[PDB]
Structure 1
Amino acid sequence: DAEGLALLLPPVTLAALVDSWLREDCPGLNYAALVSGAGPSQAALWAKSPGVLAGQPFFDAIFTQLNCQVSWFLPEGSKLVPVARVAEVRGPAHCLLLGERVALNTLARCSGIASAAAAAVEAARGAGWTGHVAGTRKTTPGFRLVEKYGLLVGGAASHRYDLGGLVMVKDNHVVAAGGVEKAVRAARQAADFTLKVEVECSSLQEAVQAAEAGADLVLLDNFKPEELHPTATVLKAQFPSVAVEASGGITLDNLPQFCGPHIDVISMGMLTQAAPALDFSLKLF
């Protein structure tokens, strides 16, 4: 339920984040305020792009700090059919216009990401796949919370939010430890019983070693689909307890080829790296 996803955001980190965006955008004197004055005003939020609406909590938080209210005519997660009237913002003219840029930028990107995620979720459902579409750690620094939240609204999984969410043995960890077995034993030992271990693998060989050493998840990285499913099928056969994730060169276009009955998770970097922002405007009436 996309409407209840707003509960995920701790209100204290939210305010801090929004604060910093507002200091970033206006550090000193706001001369443009004298142009608008402080008279009460109303603006309409317009969706000019198709996709999924995501980011209301951030949008609200921004305008709240600035003593404006927002009324939403569409719930979080709604399909957007341009040109749609999405919300109304009310408050002192100068405060409205102060929040405009940050609020739109935030909503545009969050919705951009949710849109991409929903497209990918739909494509996978359209190929009869039951697994989880997921984002990667390829997010914008300092903006991770908005991007991970966008993914969730679009129906995708956030994945590990940070390095502390699960112990991820990437190919570089393997090199540094001197081999998969050594890396996964080290990982499994270090990781609290609280955490799962995932291992990035480029071959069936590595994948089997990883599962043998107690990997909870195996990330089959950069396989061609023809090599992927045979590999995944064997892993699940020998190790039904181990989850299989696929990632690497996955696009919305080729996503159905990567879906298969033995792939539990598909994670796509494009959901955050390449997701174009939606066009929104805030017209004062």
Structure 2
Amino acid sequence: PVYEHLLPVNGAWRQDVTNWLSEDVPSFDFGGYVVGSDLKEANLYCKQDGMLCGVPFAQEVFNQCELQVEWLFKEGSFLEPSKNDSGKIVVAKITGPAKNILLAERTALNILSRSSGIATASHKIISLARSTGYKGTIAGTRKTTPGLRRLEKYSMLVGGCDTHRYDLSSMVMLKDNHIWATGSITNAVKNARAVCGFAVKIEVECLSEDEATEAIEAGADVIMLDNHFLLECSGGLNLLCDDIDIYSTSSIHQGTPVIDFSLKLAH
């Protein structure tokens, strides 16, 4: 299977790319006027060790900027520029009008650097968890960057981690506020079940042990301890793995370091 197939042939995500382009040119592209439209060649370079992520998003930028691109690696490939003399690896060869290439360049690179960063941090944390013999899952959170949720979640997947719930519409998550708002975990779960129906799971944050058998009895699908039915642990921290099914961390995606990429025209 191919991760990029998760993105619909057309939909809001492609309009996002258009809006990212507009964010960079609200009036006129002066540099484009001076550089002209002569066809040029260019190489996209990965300048740091990490996993390549964000290909279809970057590809869409190149498409809208009407360029021709040849990716040298599959998305998800782990790149190691430091095995290099030069300190970099060309992951793509681009051709098109000079102005178009230079227009696409910053936006496309901002996508790759951040997407790869998330994937790399994601893969690092799961391979690490995997090394201890842990068989459960490491999941992300909803603490994503405003407007970039689709991209960051996608990166989590590429990095080999679980995405966790996409949004507030996705898998219901009940807490203290929800439980005493209805009267009991049983009431919270029932009301939640009354509207989400059978198609979506309900997760309840439980602090006690009798706060959790009731939820399980109410029909909850996932139980969270917070520092048939699955068990989740919310905190992360590191170095702790027991037999919980899910360990969640915003560490695989938030406040994450980027992987440096670059682009240079040939001649």
TM-score (norm 1): 0.86
- For 1:242, the aligned partner's letter is F
Query: Which whole-Å CA distance do the structure 1 matches of 2:113 and 2:69 have between them?
Result: 17
Query: Which whole-Å CA distance do the structure 2 matches of 1:170 and 1:91 have between them?
Result: 53
Residues 96 and 148 from structure 1, CA distance in 2 versus in 1: closer, same or farther, beyond 3 angstroms?
A: same
- For 1:260, the aligned partner's letter is D
Query: Which whole-Å CA distance do the structure 1 matches of 2:47 and 2:129 have between them?
Result: 26
Residues 171 and 42 from structure 1, CA distance in 2 versus in 1: closer, same or farther, beyond 3 angstroms?
A: farther
Could you tell me which of 212, 217, 220 is aligned with 1:212? 217
Residue 84 of structure 2 is matched in structure 1 by: none
Query: Which whole-Å CA distance do the structure 2 matches of 1:40 and 1:152 have between them?
Result: 36
Q: Does 1:184 align with 2:182?
A: no
Q: Quote how far apart the aligned CAs of 1:175 are.
A: 4.4
In percent, how many aligned pairs have the same letter? 46
Give the ranges of 4+ consecutive aligned residues of structure 1 lying more than 6 Å apart after TM superposition: none
Q: Quote how far apart the aligned CAs of 1:260 are.
A: 2.1
Q: Quote how far apart the aligned CAs of 1:6 are.
A: 0.5
- Give the conservation status (yes or no) of the 8 Å contact 1:62–1:103: yes
Residue 118 of structure 2 is matched in structure 1 by: 113
Residue 10 of structure 2 is matched in structure 1 by: 12
Q: Quote how far apart the aligned CAs of 1:220 are.
A: 1.9
Aligned length: 259
Helix, strand or coil: the match of 1:61?
helix
Q: Does 1:244 align with 2:243?
A: no
Residue 202 of structure 2 is matched in structure 1 by: 197
Taking the TM superposition and a 5 Å limit, the aligned residue runs for 1:1-285 are 4-13=2-11, 14-82=13-81, 83-221=88-226, 223=227, 241-248=228-235, 250-251=236-237, 254=238, 256-257=239-240, 259-261=241-243, 263-285=244-266
- Give the conservation status (yes or no) of the 8 Å contact 1:60–1:69: no
Query: Which whole-Å CA distance do the structure 2 matches of 1:170 and 1:53 have between them?
Result: 37
Q: Deviations over 1:212-261 (max 9, x none)?
A: 2111001221x2xxxxxxxxxxxxxxxxx21011112x14xx1x42x223
Unmatched tracts of structure 1, length 5 or more: 224-240
- For 1:268, the aligned partner's letter is T
Helix, strand or coil: the match of 1:172?
helix
Q: Deviations over 1:38-92 (max 9, x none)?
A: 1111111111111111000001000100101211111100111022221112111
Q: Deviations over 1:97-128 (max 9, x none)?
A: 11111100111111100001100110111011
Query: Which whole-Å CA distance do the structure 1 matches of 2:26 and 2:207 have between them?
Result: 48
- What root-mean-square deviation, in Å, do the aligned CA atoms of Structure 1 and Structure 2 show? 1.5
